[PDB]
């Protein structure tokens, strides 16, 4: 009946998701399970293989010129985050009605939204023992990240913890497309001017998301409910991630935070 419009919305979203996010979950799982027979990611478990993997992973983003491993890794991670924000922003623009919102609200939705979305983006690249890096060329182990000195050793663990739980829901790119749109259009962000048009758009997206999950996962029940409860946990979890980054900005003089990242962590919670 009106389901057709929700299916249309879900596809519109999946199509723009594909355009906005070059490395999809499908590709990441393919690489992580070896389904594709491109040459495996170079595994990095320690300082030595970090060094040896340099041909494939290419940590040459320090181009004024280097430093201890923890800083070089963090800046590698930081680099990709900046691009992630560029991607989430382009994807937001494709969500119907979003660019008609007040530009202050557009900014505010993204400011709070990106972090929650990045956690979901990392999950796609993750298993219980590590994360894909360099567009699937490399794989950094969870043990190696943990073993780094403070404050950097605990930076990725919360994402690993979340990723284990989140990936068990076994969502794909077509589910994730709509799920990301829902997060972005939360009308309970601090400092929003016009809540009503945000909530109107989000109404549709949750209807679209509910339908998608029934059709695409009919065997799996209360997935919609499971998924919303994760989404609320995610908001809770991001409040710690922000605090660790304040410390790194204020303590670590060797490096510095990319201005964009300074905008999205500035004046938050």
């Amino acid at each position: 009946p009106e389901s057709a419009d929700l299916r249309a919305l879900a596809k519109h979203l999946y199509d723009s998701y594909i355009k906005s996010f070059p490395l999809t979950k499908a590709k990441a799982r393919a690489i992580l399970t070896g389904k594709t027979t491109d040459k495996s990611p170079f595994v990095i478990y320690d300082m030595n293989s970090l060094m040896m993997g340099e041909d494939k992973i290419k940590f040459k983003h320090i181009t004024p010129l280097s430093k201890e491993v923890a800083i070089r890794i963090f800046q590698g991670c930081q680099f990709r985050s900046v691009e992630a924000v560029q991607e989430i922003t382009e994807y937001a623009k494709s969500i119907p009605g979003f660019v008609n919102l007040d530009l202050n609200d557009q900014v505010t939705l993204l400011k709070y939204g990106v972090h929650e979305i990045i956690y979901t983006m990392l999950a796609s690249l993750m298993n219980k023992d590590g994360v894909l890096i360099s567009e699937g060329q490399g794989f950094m182990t969870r043990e190696f990240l943990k073993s780094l000195r403070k404050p950097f050793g605990d930076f990725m663990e919360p994402k690993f913890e979340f990723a284990v739980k989140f990936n068990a829901l076994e969502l794909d790119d077509s589910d994730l497309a709509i799920f990301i749109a829902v997060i972005i259009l939360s009308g309970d962000r601090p400092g929003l001017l016009n809540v009503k048009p945000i909530e109107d758009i989000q109404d549709n997206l949750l209807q679209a998301l509910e339908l998608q999950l029934k059709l695409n996962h009919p065997e799996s029940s209360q997935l919609f409910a499971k998924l919303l409860q994760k989404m609320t946990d995610l908001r809770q979890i991001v409040t710690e991630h922000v605090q660790l980054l304040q410390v790194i900005k204020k303590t670590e003089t060797d490096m510095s935070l990319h201005p964009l990242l300074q905008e999205i962590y500035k004046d938050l919670y």
Binding site: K93, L103, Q106, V107, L260, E263
Partner: peptide, 10 residues
């Protein structure tokens, strides 16, 4: 939020 503003308008 100069950059964020700029990404949204461009």
């Amino acid at each position: 939020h100069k950059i964020l503003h700029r990404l949204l308008q461009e």
